[PDB]
Design a binder for this molecule. Structure first.
Ligand code: FES
Length: 98
């Protein structure tokens, strides 16, 4: 009936986790529902510093101020964990790294 999902998210800052979440994957919602409590940053789509990365999974990620900057070249640059869609996320790196 429902589709199960597994989010593997490791921060290049040095954190690494593999949780379970169905229907609504969302690395924040799933690990907020499992036991941990993460948080991207401002979620305003205007910093361009949180250059996160996406290993695999068809999940979605859309900037917030697209009318200031298109997220294409920024997507082909890397991925942003400020939006994070729960469509299908298999493995993702966090927005921090160093
Ligand atoms: S747009 Fe502000 S840290 Fe992501």
């Amino acid at each position: 009936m429902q589709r199960v999902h597994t989010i593997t998210a490791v921060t290049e800052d040095g954190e690494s986790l593999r949780f379970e979440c169905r229907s609504d994957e969302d690395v924040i919602t799933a690990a907020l529902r499992q036991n941990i409590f993460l948080m991207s940053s401002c979620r305003e789509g205007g910093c361009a510093t949180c250059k996160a990365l996406c290993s695999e999974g068809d999940y979605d990620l859309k900037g917030c101020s697209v009318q200031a900057l298109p997220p294409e070249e920024e997507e082909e640059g890397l991925v942003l964990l400020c939006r994070t869609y729960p469509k299908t996320d298999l493995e993702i790196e966090l927005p921090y790294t160093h």
